[PDB]
Design a binder for this molecule. Structure first.
Ligand SMILES: *OP(=O)(O)OC[C@H]1O[C@@H](n2cnc3c(N)ncnc32)[C@H](O)[C@@H]1O
Ligand SMILES: [Cl-]
Ligand code: NA
Length: 644
DNA sequence: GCTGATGCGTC
DNA sequence: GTCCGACGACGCATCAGC
């Protein structure tokens, strides 16, 4: 029999044979080390096509040898516990994980924390650290389905003392780990596999696997490589077609618990016949590409007529009305938000004509002040409870701004152009001020009308504009293009938006792609009255890899053992390295917000809270400035008042 | 019963 | 352009520690 040790499993080898090259036997549970070895081969390469090939080899072996393990292997590859709408959560972050690592090795938690920060990867700590769990019975090798089941066991532990019970399971995994298993167990619990391969590449690998090695054959499979009889050109075309069948099905039913059973019993070619868009099952939403100006919009939408719509500052609400009366509401990430919006559920009868029997709406839920009849900031919206049984205790009302209709009266509109979907939205749904209204829109290609419309959207409490084609490539087919829309935010344009010069007072050690480097920095404004620097926000995006390496080498020279007495951070995360205040950086943000932690400008707007920056990003170093020329706290308060 | 640290999801 | 993973503020919900 095939007695290959999984430590030598090589799913990246040439001429991979699903049966003979697997490190397990027919009917045997897929070993977790097989998955870990696949992860190693994937993280070693940078070309997605190579990663997809390697994963597909693993999946073809699972299909051929252990079909029941396909679903857990996929979820482990995605680092997910299940369908997003089920709401499974590990309840385990770096905190609980590092505590588990410490106990499993007898080390002090702070020593474990320090090492993980230096290496920028908890997996390398769990890998290299030495276990202290002296067991008198060598544990059996971990299996993929067993590890996945233990992860779901962790997620189900709730209530007081549950943290210790979660840690006991985690420790049980580590003691059974061999070779590279501990590294990826810890990374999975940390939420940072660092594969370079995610949903789109996992789907590509899955469609390729079940296409090359069809499921459901008598063992041993007579057809183990269905591409051997095709030319390279025909093989590529065939695999891309099969890949699109799976992609467009998944974007309408992003639920592996539903797809994989059908895939194993009926095959991929027949997948659309057994899995289709239906109210009650969330679908992948259409996303938007950032655009830096009106001119770039025209260039992208040359010839194609398009519409402009207010980009409201709320939360996406995918509203499902099932045939029968049941209503469900999903987030942009397919999370179930139904229990969050009892006021919307009781509102659905008002928004539709008697002929509407089912639908899927794409809306933005925006906080709404019914007394003033005005949109309220996104920050107010986030104060709503996550579960509210009684709509009578809601304190922050919401107004739905609908902008798309994806499903209507039992028929999918995914293949209809926006012009038609928008017309069906207007013809079948009813507006009520402050409760359910159509997104404010403008149909034009005049640059001056758009710039004016953009200016009004901001005055009307919006982030800018969304731009969408009406008839050319204007469908709702996410598998063809997920970012089919354009977003034109104020803070994208040149010379527009809040720009601040802030002092770098601390650095945080980078993780993953930032390991061995500084991944983030602590910034401060200058409080002129007290001659102190006040932390305002952290910063971790906007610089190239080259800039980020120069910052590391230059700021290293400013590392202090202890903070300066005139630097105030209060509730901010203590930096891994305090920095002698010197470097001044130009930073752009979308908005200023009242912060629960940052002291910057405390007392100039509110007695207790300071001010922070929404979506800050690095622009450039101000080498012509010292800390005393940084943006002052008083200026921060002025910007905040001018904003509100 | 209270508070602050942790987890996770929203943008 | 796609895909991916670095990184942000802040809120509710949860739970350990007191
Ligand atoms: O910045 P981003 O890419 O998340 O923006 C997209 C999101 O913007 C919200 N939104 C608000 N108003 C609209 C309209 N009218 N059309 C499309 N999207 C809109 C959504 O929440 C969206 O995901
Ligand atoms: Cl400069
Ligand atoms: Na959510």
């Amino acid at each position: 029999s095939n007695d290959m040790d999984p430590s030598g499993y090589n799913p990246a080898k040439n001429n991979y044979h699903p049966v003979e090259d697997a490190c397990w036997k027919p009917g045997q549970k897929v070993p977790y080390l097989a998955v870990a070895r696949t992860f190693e081969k994937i993280e070693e390469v940078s070309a997605r096509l190579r990663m997809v090939e390697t994963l597909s080899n693993l999946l073809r072996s699972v299909v051929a040898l252990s079909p029941p393990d396909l679903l857990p292997v996929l979820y482990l590859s995605l680092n997910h516990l299940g369908p997003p709408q089920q709401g499974l959560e590990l309840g385990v972050g770096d905190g609980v994980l590092l505590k588990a690592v410490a106990q499993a090795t007898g080390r002090q938690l702070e020593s474990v924390r320090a090492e993980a920060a230096e290496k920028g990867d908890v997996g390398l700590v769990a890998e290299n650290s030495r276990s202290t769990q002296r067991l008198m019975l060598p544990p059996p090798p971990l299996t993929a389905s067993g590890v996945f089941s233990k992860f779901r066991d962790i997620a189900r532990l709730t209530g007081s003392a549950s943290t210790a019970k979660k840690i006991d399971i985690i420790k049980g995994l580590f003691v059974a780990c061999r070779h590279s298993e501990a590294r990826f167990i810890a990374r999975s619990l940390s939420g940072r596999l660092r594969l370079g391969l995610a949903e789109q590449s996992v789907l590509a690998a899955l469609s390729q696997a079940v296409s090359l090695t069809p499921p459901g054959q008598e063992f041993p499979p007579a057809m183990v490589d269905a591409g051997k009889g095709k030319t390279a050109e025909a093989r590529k075309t065939w695999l891309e077609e099969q890949g699109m069948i799976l992609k467009q099905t998944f974007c309408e039913v992003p639920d592996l618990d539903r797809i994989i059973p059908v895939l194993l019993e009926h095959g991929l070619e027949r997948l659309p016949e057994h899995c289709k868009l239906s109210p009650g099952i969330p679908l992948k939403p259409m996303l938007a590409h950032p655009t830096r100006g009106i001119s770039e919009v025209l260039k992208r939408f040359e010839e194609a007529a398009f519409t402009c719509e207010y980009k409201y500052d709320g939360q996406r609400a995918q509203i499902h009305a099932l045939e029968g009366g049941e209503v469900k509401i999903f987030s942009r990430n397919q999370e179930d938000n139904t229990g969050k919006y009892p006021d919307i559920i009781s509102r659905i009868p008002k928004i539709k004509l008697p002929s509407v029997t089912s639908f899927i709406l794409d809306t933005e839920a925006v906080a709404w002040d019914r007394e003033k009849k005005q949109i309220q900031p996104f920050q107010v919206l986030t104060t709503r409870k996550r579960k509210e049984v009684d709509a009578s205790e809601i304190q922050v009302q919401v107004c739905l701004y609908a902008f798309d209709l994806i499903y209507l009266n039992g028929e999918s509109l995914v293949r209809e152009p926006l012009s038609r979907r928008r017309q069906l939205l207007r013809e079948n749904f009813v507006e009520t001020e402050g409760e359910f209204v159509f997104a404010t829109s403008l149909d034009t290609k005049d640059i001056e009308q758009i710039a004016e419309f953009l200016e009004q959207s901001v005055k009307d409490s919006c982030e800018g504009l969304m731009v969408k084609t009406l008839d050319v490539d204007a469908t709702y087919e996410i598998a063809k293009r997920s970012h089919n829309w354009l977003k034109l935010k104020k803070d994208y344009l040149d010379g527009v938006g809040d720009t601040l010069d802030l002092v770098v007072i601390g650095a945080y050690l980078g993780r993953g792609k930032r390991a061995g480097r500084y991944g983030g920095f602590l910034l401060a404004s200058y409080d002129e009255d007290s001659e102190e620097l006040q932390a305002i926000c952290k910063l971790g995006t906007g610089f190239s890899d080259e800039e980020l390496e120069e910052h590391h080498q230059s700021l290293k020279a400013l590392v202090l053992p202890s903070p300066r007495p005139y630097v105030r951070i209060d509730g901010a995360v203590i930096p891994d390295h305090w920095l002698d205040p010197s470097a001044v950086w130009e930073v752009k943000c979308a908005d200023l917000s009242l912060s629960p932690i940052y002291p910057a400008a405390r007392g100039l707007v509110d007695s207790d809270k300071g001010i922070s920056l929404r979506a800050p990003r690095f622009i450039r170093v101000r080498e012509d400035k010292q800390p005393e020329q940084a943006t002052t706290s008083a200026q921060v308060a002025c910007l905040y008042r001018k904003q509100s």
